[PDB]
Ligand binder design. Sequence first.
Ligand code: GTP
Ligand code: MG
Lengths: 147, 172
Amino acid sequence: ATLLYGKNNVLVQPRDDMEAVPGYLSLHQTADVMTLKWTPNQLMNGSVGDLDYEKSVYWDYAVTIRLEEIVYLHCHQQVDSGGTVVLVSQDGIQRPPFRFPKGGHLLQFLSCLENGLLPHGQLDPPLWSQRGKGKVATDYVFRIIYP
Amino acid sequence: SLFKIILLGDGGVGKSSLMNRYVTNKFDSQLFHTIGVEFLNKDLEVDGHFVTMQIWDTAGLERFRSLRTPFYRGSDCCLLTFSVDDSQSFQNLSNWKKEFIYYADVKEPESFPFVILGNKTDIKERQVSTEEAQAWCKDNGDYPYFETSAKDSTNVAAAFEEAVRRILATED
Ligand SMILES: Nc1nc2c(ncn2[C@@H]2O[C@H](COP(=O)(O)OP(=O)(O)OP(=O)(O)O)[C@@H](O)[C@H]2O)c(=O)[nH]1
Ligand SMILES: [Mg+2]
């Protein structure tokens, strides 16, 4: 079990009325199986107490997804802002976007995702390709492919 | 090949700021304690060696110890960081070195490359003097010492390059 990517302060907003919750986003590979996790900060930072830890409201917000369940990544990178990505799953379940902090974190995540899918999988179109630099704000759609 | 470099040091000494200054040439004044681990890649050439370094940023806070220690293993060089305006962070250097050795399980601990950074050198009101820091470095393994400022870039690149240089030296 190895860590391919980690990023603090990835926000997710469970509903549009309530403010975004900051959390840690990680990519992990155990064998050839990649899994994406997002965990609200209060569950990492030890700020719930032993007795409440097992049934905290924040456990309802934690996500863990096997990458093979993902068919599309629909990314959105506004200038002077943080990128968002929506994972589109084979099951059709609506998932809230992850929002990255300002900077090139979106691309970095896409890059570690790509580096890890190899050699059995890859992003389509490739990150290095002309199509892979999105279309103009900026909008990306990637498919995960297994040759 | 791939040269893994890890930043350790008390909360708030400027570990994240150093990585971001070196990799992206940017500085943020904002307060946020790193919780989970992160890394960035950077390529450069050193003494005619073309190299990929992977810089691992970690939580400095005592309470977040279990979130950083699993990633000590496999490190090629450790950047132990303190802030020159924070004597406590300086006094913690030994404990940081001890902690790394314990969790990284390195065969030869007194051969292992450390590089020591006294960050925030742009702050004139110091609590640690240069000679004091130089003296500690010499009496605890004869490590390279750099006075750095992530805010104004002072010696930031020099420090990371020396880390690669130290790694290159140990491959023998
Ligand atoms: N004046 C000055 N401030 C700095 C310098 N480096 C970092 N800071 C500031 O000090 C604070 C701490 O910065 P961080 O990089 O987040 O410290 P850290 O070591 O990464 O802290 P932890 O995540 O808690 O382990 C922030 O407000 C930074 O802007 C510096 O070189 N000079
Ligand atoms: Mg930090």
